[PDB]
Amino acid sequence: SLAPEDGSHRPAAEPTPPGAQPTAPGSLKAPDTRNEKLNSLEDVRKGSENYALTTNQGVRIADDQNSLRAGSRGPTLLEDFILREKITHFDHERIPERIVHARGSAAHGYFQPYKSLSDITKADFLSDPNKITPVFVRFSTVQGGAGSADTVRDIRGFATKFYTEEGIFDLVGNNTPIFFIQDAHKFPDFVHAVKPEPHWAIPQGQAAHDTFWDYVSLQPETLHNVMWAMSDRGIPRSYRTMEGFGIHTFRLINAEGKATFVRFHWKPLAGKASLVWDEAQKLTGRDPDFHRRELWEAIEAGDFPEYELGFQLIPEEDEFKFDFDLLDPTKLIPEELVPVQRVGKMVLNRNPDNFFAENEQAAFHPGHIVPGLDFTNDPLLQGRLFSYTDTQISRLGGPNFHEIPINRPTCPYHNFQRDGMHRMGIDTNPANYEPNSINDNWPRETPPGPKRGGFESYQERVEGNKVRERSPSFGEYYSHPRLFWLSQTPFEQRHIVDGFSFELSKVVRPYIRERVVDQLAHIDLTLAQAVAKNLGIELTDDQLNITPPPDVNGLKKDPSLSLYAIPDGDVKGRVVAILLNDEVRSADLLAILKALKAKGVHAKLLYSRMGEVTADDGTVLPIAATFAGAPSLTVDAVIVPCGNIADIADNGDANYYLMEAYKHLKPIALAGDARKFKATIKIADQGEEGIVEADSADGSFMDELLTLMAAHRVWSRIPKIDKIPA
Amino acid sequence: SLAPEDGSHRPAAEPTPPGAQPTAPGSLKAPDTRNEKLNSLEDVRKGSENYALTTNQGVRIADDQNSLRAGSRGPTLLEDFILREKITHFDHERIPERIVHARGSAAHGYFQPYKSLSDITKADFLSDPNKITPVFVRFSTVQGGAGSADTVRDIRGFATKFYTEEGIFDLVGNNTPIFFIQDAHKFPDFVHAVKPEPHWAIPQGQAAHDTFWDYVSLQPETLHNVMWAMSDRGIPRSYRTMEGFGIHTFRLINAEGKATFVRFHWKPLAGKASLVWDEAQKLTGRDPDFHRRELWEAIEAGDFPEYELGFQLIPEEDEFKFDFDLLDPTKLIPEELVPVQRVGKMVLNRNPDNFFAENEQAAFHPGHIVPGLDFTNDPLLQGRLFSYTDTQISRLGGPNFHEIPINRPTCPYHNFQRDGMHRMGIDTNPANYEPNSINDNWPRETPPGPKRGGFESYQERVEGNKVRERSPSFGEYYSHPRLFWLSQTPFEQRHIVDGFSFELSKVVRPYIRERVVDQLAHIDLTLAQAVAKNLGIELTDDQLNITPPPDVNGLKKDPSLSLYAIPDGDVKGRVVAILLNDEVRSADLLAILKALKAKGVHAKLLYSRMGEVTADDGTVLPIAATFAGAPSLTVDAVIVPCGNIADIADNGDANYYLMEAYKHLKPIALAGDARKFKATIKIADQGEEGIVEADSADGSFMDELLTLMAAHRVWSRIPKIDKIPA
Ligand code: HDD
Ligand code: HEM
């Protein structure tokens, strides 16, 4: 037997903190976590233990180590069907990746509404607070391939498949409340401009190249979502710590037939948090799978991603009441004008079993709505409805992608559609058409009605000529980017400046940089000037005299647009690095771990080598990673306990660990003789807001560190970090 | 008309150094670089300037900014065929990536032999020194997807398609002279074990995870290629500075019918050069396209990648004269025992026009041989012959992938094969079968012969029973790894130890680390002890007493197995960072730039912002990048000229630039007051080997720095770097 006798190959089927056990398929890690969708997949889950190895035809294999040959040094024979089946399968493993959002990470979970919403919608999944709907969610980046890195600067996708009793509803959103373009006709142009350039296929996962900024400089409608992407919104800390938005205005339809306009929101119950650029870009090198890993391990730990679904509702009579068009997906609806009403809660509580079968093959599409919902004439949403059914014909091999197990509805589905590649369902209906008498016309149409009704489109009035023309109301491009700019804290504004400065410095053709800075002068001169100075461009007198755009219905700022202006911090699920030494003061470690445990914060024990170290009281401490192997980039704060500090005080990696954490605005805590590390990062003996220090690690020490962590980063340190060489 | 009036949007069609001009399609950058294959591609090359925008049916488009709707705020109409053609084409842009070596970078070039090899092979392309054969080469990594990073630790692929007058020959090799496994039947197991794990699809581009080292610990045949991947061979500086190997013993067949065993080699004329791990890993975040970029720009600069083809030749009578089986792809043939005979030169001198069309769709397959070459019974080679035709059926959409332009032969091809998806050729033969009388049996078979004859397999004798059995002669696993280890310099050995140590520290299940350390103890006790000490593992007395494996045919070392033991340095094509200040000594900068230009070394002028700076004498100096924008990871050396040093002396990024270059063993040269930076890297007054310092950049300053650049890195600095926090 190849397993170790102690059973240490196999993870415990209980929640455990990140790193404590090897990760495992969901159904093995959490066998008792169920929901109607998870259960329904049992027909296709395949075990392995105690079973014979076979071909795909069920023939047991005696020797899976050798090809069939004529003599043991002889040629391989064509009659080796075992070799050829295995190699043929392998040779055809790959399927086309998604045209956009190819890089993504997913989990199973459930949603339920807080109260019935039957006064505004007849959608069944929102009709009953005690009716649970399983979900499957995929989070993604946009530009890079399926093997690109997670912590790039990009917009993030947040797609939710709701397996309702009246059909699948897919809410296919992003983490910013607008898109870059107005009309779907332009999507291939925009996507080609952001994607790797076609001659050399560079750069991966980066908008920082000429063709993207060329498109931006020529299409000012892009500027709003570009401001979002250049802010710290572009580099979330975790999929758990970003917002979601459906972007488009949709309709809700109630049983009386009344339509209300709606925009959809997800509020992360873990709070909003992002990285800083230098950290994000280095993390794509040190751990290109960091968000994928963090999501999977939060779920294994019981730190389940939770989000609150929220609706901005606007009555039909108020369609034209703002100074922007509701159907323009480059405009946001400020929550100061239309509040987000809380609707329900979604909990992600199980990882998939096989990433390819469940994540790679999942198909989401915003056209998959249910009775009680409907579309609007938003010209971006209108073209998305064509694309998501079409692309699955090549990506998933044919028109039967709904029979791939992750995509299957859990409610009944019956119709007269037949055949297609890899057809699974065997229809027994004598009829494959309707109307028919030979099956008494089953399956039959259902009239629309208050519940369990057929889908009917809201009878919106259409009046105009057949035209390819952009609505004049869409031709305003600068006021929303300006509202966003003015809503950010001063440090968030600095990071926006630095985002544009860094990206445009990688554009080789200087005139493109100049044209972008001229667009910025149409938004805000302080922003335009700060970017120009980093690019060595001087604004012209004319540019300095551009009139700022109008306020948005009187608003000079809306703090809900900022990540940080209103505290919402939650430490549960975060992780602290603990830098060990070979004689750790076990009293410090007791106090540190007790306080972390009470707040659901995880620890990773690091040292200069792997294996174990023994603390002052004999406690054996297994080492999670070396200082170089698990860099500060990967944690939220660093604690250095007392002990034999001499052991690590001259270690370059341990000093660098602190210098990188300090540069990246993370809280650092130093107990006892670990305070000698203050010399490495400057710090007055008097101390610094953001560095916790004391004779020992105790109640008070841990309290201060935990309070720092609830504020996420130490923004006050920003002016101290330009001078530090790290 | 949106182009700048000055014409600065368009790169000059002449060779230009990296970063001087935007990069461009090959045929626009270097229109006069031609070869027979590049010329034959003219029938499918499509221009653009001065043409009307059309659908794919040739219909001019009036408004490519808008969908057709009913009213300019109304719904989009199904009758918009222009939108639907455009979005349908976008929706189906992606094809499946290659199952392995999905990440790769390619160029066109040509091959010519030094002399006729008619005495040993009747292969037409090797028959005449004046015969030029166009090639297309793709270099790749092995594990990561097409969107993964370039400078991972991995084996690299080096695949060459020779478009010969007697058919396509594809030499599909790697950058190490052996493979991980012995029998193709194991290829899916090995590849599954190294690829991202199947529950969560982590990690991308890394073998540093449990399932890879699990397989290694259980399959000792893997140890030899694992030693090479853990060495600095696994992290090449460039595709131009690595070796290539076809790995398998093949046969050469001459016109008298004599077979000679042959292994193929490519020697890089630029010399052998690798990164160090920290630098490689960080570079996968700061520039995940570093090797792709470097290859493209070398070619644009005229620094053409050049390689020398070499053969190791073994007479048929000497098949059994070595300690290892010639057919075993885990064994190398030491150059001390069988020298590489130089055969010809390949020069890559033009980039593709379109990466998808030429790179992504190119199909190489080692079964594509020509008369004059033949296979052996190597059991890994034998299974490869099945896989590369099979996998193109899905990857490239059918059996007509040879009609995709890049894959087309330039010589005649005619046969009786018909139809298949995407069939381009319209056959006019009345017959689609042979023998036929209705076309007088054309096209006709051709007897074998000395030139232009049909392919016949060498009549090797086969004798044996039909078995799935590994030859006993393959059952030796440790001697070649030990020969590799003993052949390395001491700094190379240290890097091997650090490689294994880093990788195994990422293995979560400790018993696997233990089992690998046990395997290392079978190779070399010094290596096993040093890895064990880094993992906190103590060898047992049994392990300490394992007797070493025997020498390889009497060899205790072979220096051709080392990257660095025999100096082969070439600076041309390398790049230096020049860290500017706001009043540079122009005399220094004149001396520096001209000395670099004389040796073909490129420079990049860096500063704290973009735009220009003005030298002491008023010379305006354009800035290529900021210190953070183009990190030291991306250059071979760093020069800091004299001037107003206090301008950058306090700049964290400028100091960190030097500390990083220092840690990564790069030469650093400091002129005049730049010597103030010696305190940053802790250099003594009397200086140290590997730091060039003088009062000015004149006399021997540049000659010294170039002498350092020729030795690639300052290995003697390794003891001095462990203490620096960088
Ligand atoms: C039985 C399967 C099998 C085995 C044992 C190997 N390969 Fe392979 N290799 C493939 C099956 C395969 C493949 C699946 O057919 C690929 C992927 C897509 C393609 O066109 O070929 C491939 C791709 C591939 C590429 C990329 C070619 C390109 O750029 O398109 C290179 C350089 C190699 N291989 C080199 C090797 C070497 C040097 C091997 C051992 C000596 C080796 N392969 C063993
Ligand atoms: C409103 C801004 C947009 C948002 C928030 C959006 C959202 C998304 C998301 C989240 C995914 C990933 C779903 C998954 O996890 O698999 C996706 C995939 C896709 N999107 Fe949209 N998208 C938008 C604009 C568009 C437009 C306008 C089009 C068409 C013109 C489009 C065509 C596609 C295609 C082809 C895919 C790949 C789907 C698959 O292969 O299954 N995207 N988009």
User: Using CB atoms, which residue from B24, B96, B149 is nearest to A95?
Assistant: B96
Pairing of strands A259-268, A250-253: antiparallel
Q: Which ligand is nearest to the CA of A366?
A: 2
Determine how many CB atoms are found less than 10 A away from the CB of residue A116.
14
Secondary structure (H, E, C), A328-384: CCCCCCCCCCCCEEEEEEEEEEECCCCHHHHHHCCCCCCCCCCCCEECCCCHHHHHH
The burial of A3, by beta-carbon neighbours within 10 Å (0-12 exposed, 13-18 middle, 19 or more buried), is given as exposed
Give the residue among A714, A711, A709, A337 at the shortest CA–CA distance from A560.
Answer: A337
Q: For residue B101, report the distance from its CA to the centre of ligand 1, in Å.
A: 7
- Chain B residues with CB under 8 Å of A16 CB are none
B contact test, residue of A85, A199, A202 with most B CBs within 10 A? A199
Nearest CA to B284 out of B174, B139, B157, B144 is that of B144
Asked if the Cβ–Cβ distance from A64 to B185 is below 8 Å, we say: yes
Q: Please report where in the chains the tokens 């997913």 appear, as a residue.
A: A106
Are B83 and B270 in contact by the 8 Å Cβ rule? The answer is no
Pairing relationship of beta strands A575-579 and A637-640 according to DSSP bridges = parallel
Q: Looking at ligand 1, which atom is closest to the CA of residue B329? A: 41
Q: Do B377 and A74 touch (CB under 8 A)?
A: yes
Instruction: Looking at the structure, tell me whether residues A555 and A600 fall in a common domain.
Output: no
B460 belongs to a structural domain: no
Residue B91 beta carbon below 6 angstroms from any ligand 2 atom:
yes
In this structure, are A485 and A505 located in the same domain? yes
CATH number of the domain at B135, please. 2.40.180.10
- Whether residue B265 contacts residue B534, with contact meaning beta carbons closer than 8 Å, is answered with no
For residue B104, which ligand has an atom nearest its CA? 1
Amino acid identity at B529: Q
Q: With contact defined as beta carbons under 8 Å apart, do A274 and A235 qualify?
A: yes
CB-ligand 1 contact for B383 (6 Å cutoff): yes
Which tokens belong to B64? 């490519």
A54 φ/ψ angles, rounded to the nearest 5 degrees: -135, 170
Residues 6+ apart with CB under 8 A from A1: none
- Resolution in angstroms comes to 1.7
Residues of B in contact with A319 (CB under 8 A): none
Nearest-by-Cβ selection for A462 from B71, B466, B504: B71
Catalytic residues of B: 101, 174
Establish whether residue A172 lines the binding site of ligand 2, counting it when its CB lies within 6 angstroms of any ligand atom. Answer: yes
Question: Is A205 close to B473, i.e. CB distance below 8 A?
Answer: no
Q: Would A664 be classed as within a structural domain?
A: yes
Of B22, B202, B288, the CB nearest to A293: B202
Mutate to test the interface with A, among B202, B291, B626 (most CBs of A within 10 A): B202
Q: Mutating which of A154, A495, A610 best tests the B interface, going by the most B Cβ atoms within 10 A?
A: A610
Cα separation, A663 vs A660, whole angstroms: 5
Q: Domain residues for B204?
A: 24-409
Residue A374 burial class via C-beta count within 10 angstroms: exposed 0-12, middle 13-18, buried 19 and up: middle
Find how far residue B579's CA is from the centre of its chain.
30
B201, A292 contact by CB (below 8 A): yes
Q: Is B388 annotated as a binding residue?
A: yes
Closest CA relative to residue A654, chosen from A615, A626, A683, A676: A626
Q: Which residues pair with A341 in a beta bridge?
A: A311
Tell me the HSE value of A552 on the side-chain side, using a 13 A CA sphere.
25
Q: Does ligand 2 come within 6 angstroms of the Cβ of B218?
A: no
For B63-99, b/e burial (b = at least 16 CB within 10 A) is eeebbbbbbbbbbbeeebebbbebbbebbeebbbbbb
Distance CA A26, CA A414 (A): 31
| Token code pair at residue B369 | 């041989």
Residue A8 lies in a domain: no
Calpha distance B11→B6 (Å, rounded): 12
Q: Which residues does chain A have within 8 Å of residue B286's beta carbon, measured at their own beta carbons?
A: 281-282, 285
Instruction: Give the residue, out of B101, B358, B395, B396, with the most ligand 1 atoms within 8 A of its beta carbon, to mutate for a pocket test.
Output: B101
**Residue A389, ligand 2, Cβ within 6 A:** no
Shared-domain flag, residues A282 and A349: yes
CA distance from start to end of chain A: 49
Residue A15 included in any domain: no
- Would you call A38 helix, strand, or coil by DSSP? helix
Residues A563 and A587 placed together within one structural domain of the fold? no
Kindly state whether residues B174 and B195 are assigned to the same domain: yes
User: What is the residue with the minimal CA distance to atom 37 of ligand 1?
Assistant: B173
**Ligand 2 near A157 CB (within 6 A):** yes
Tell me the backbone φ, ψ of residue B263, rounded to 5 degrees: -110, 140
Query: Residue B178: CB within 6 Å of ligand 1?
Result: no
Q: Which ligand is nearest to the CA of B186?
A: 1
Cα of B305 vs its chain's centroid, Å: 11
Per DSSP, the three-state class of A566 is: coil
* Residue corresponding to tokens 């009213």: B71
For residue B399, cis peptide bond before it (omega within 30 degrees of 0): no
Domain end point (choices A525, A553, A572) = A572
- The C-alpha atoms of residue A578 and residue A642 are separated, in whole angstroms, by 11
CA distance A12 to A5: 16
Q: Name the experimental technique.
A: X-ray
Element at B526 (helix H, strand E): helix B525-535
Cβ(A539) – ligand 2 distance below 6 Å: no
Residue A663 and residue A714 share a domain: yes
Q: How far is C-alpha B523 from the geometric centre of its chain's CA atoms?
A: 29
In a domain, B453, yes or no: no
Same domain for A551 and A577 = no
Outline where DSSP puts E strands in B612-702: 612-614, 620-622, 625-626, 637-640, 668-671, 691-694
Helix segments in A434-524, DSSP class H: 479-486, 490-505, 510-523
List CB contacts (< 8 A) between B292 and chain A.
200-202
Q: Is A448 helix (H, G, I), strand (E, B) or coil?
A: coil
In chain B, whose CA is at the least distance from the CA of A474? B73
CATH of the domain at A606: 3.40.50.880
Compare CB distances from A470 to B65, B511, B659 and report the shortest one's residue: B65
Residue B623 tokens read as 């800035």
Task: Look at A199 and B25 and tell me if their CB atoms are within 8 Å.
Answer: yes
CB-based burial label for B711 (10 Å; 0-12, 13-18, 19+): middle
Tell me which of B544, B572, B600 is where a domain ends.
B572
- Chain A CA closest to residue B724: A652
Work out how many domains chain B is built from and give that number. Answer: 3
* Among candidate residues A364, A351, A455, A350, the one with its CA nearest the CA of residue A404: A364
* C-alpha A100 – ligand 2 centre gap (Å): 7
Atom 17, ligand 2: residue with shortest CA distance: A101
For the four alpha carbons of A116, A118, A124 and A125, in that order, the dihedral sign comes to negative
Of A525, A544, A572, which residue constitutes the final position of a domain? A572
How many angstroms separate the alpha carbon of residue A172 from the centre of ligand 2? Answer: 7
Give the number of whichever ligand sits closest to the CA of residue A384: 2
Q: B301 and B400: one domain? A: yes
Regarding whether A586 and A540 lie in a shared domain, the answer is: no
Judge if B66 and B91 occupy the same domain: yes
Contacts of B655 in chain A (CB under 8 A): 725
What is the rounded distance in angstroms from the CA atom of residue B274 to the CA atom of residue B228?
Answer: 12
Residues A298 and A105 sit within 8 Å (Cβ to Cβ): no
Task: Give the list of residues 6+ apart from residue A158 with CB closer than 8 angstroms, or none.
Answer: A137, A139, A173, A174, A175, A239, A242, A244, A266
Which residues of A are less than 8 Å from B21 in CB distance?
508
Contacts of B43 (CB under 8 A, 6+ apart): none
Q: Which residues in A lie closer than 8 A to residue B222 (C-beta atoms)?
A: none
Q: Is residue A455 part of a domain?
A: no
Asked if residue A614 and residue A509 are part of one domain, the reply reads no
Tokens 């009758």 belong to: B79
Ligand 2 touching residue A380 (CB < 6 A): yes
CA B26 / ligand 1 centre spacing (Å): 27
Q: Test A218 with B509 for CB contact under 8 angstroms.
A: no
The answer to the question of residue A443 being in a domain is no
Chains A and B form CB pairs within 8 A to the count of 449
Catalytic residues of A: 101, 174
A282, closest residue in chain B (CA to CA) = B285
Same domain, B116 and B134: yes
Give the whole-angstrom CA distance, residue B610 versus residue B629: 10
Residue A152, domain member (yes or no)? yes
For a mutational test of ligand 1's pocket, the pick from B143, B388, B391, i.e. the residue with the most ligand atoms closer than 8 A to its C-beta, is B388
Annotated binding-site residues of A for heme read: 388
Atom 36 (ligand 1) nearest CA: B173
DSSP A197: P
Q: Return all residues near B4 (Cβ < 8 A) that are at least 6 apart.
A: A511
The DSSP bridge partners found for residue B321 are: none
Q: Do B87 and A386 touch (CB under 8 A)?
A: yes
Of all ligands present, the nearest one to the C-alpha of A367 is 2
Shortest CB distance from A506 goes to which of B383, B387, B629? B629
- Alpha-carbon span B207 to B153, nearest angstrom: 8
Cα B95 → chain centroid = 23
Q: Is B638 exposed, middle or buried (0-12, 13-18, 19+ CB in 10 A)?
A: buried
Q: Which residues of chain B neighbour A2 with C-beta distances below 8 Å?
A: 218
Are the beta carbons of A610 and B505 separated by less than 8 Å?
Answer: yes
**Helix A277-286, helix A490-505: angle, nearest 10:** 60
Helix/strand/coil for A54: strand
CA distance to partner chain B, nearest, from residue A74 (Å): 6
Q: Please, what is the Cα angle at A139 between A137 and A141, to 5 degrees?
A: 160
Q: What is the CATH number of the domain that holds A502?
A: 1.20.1370.20
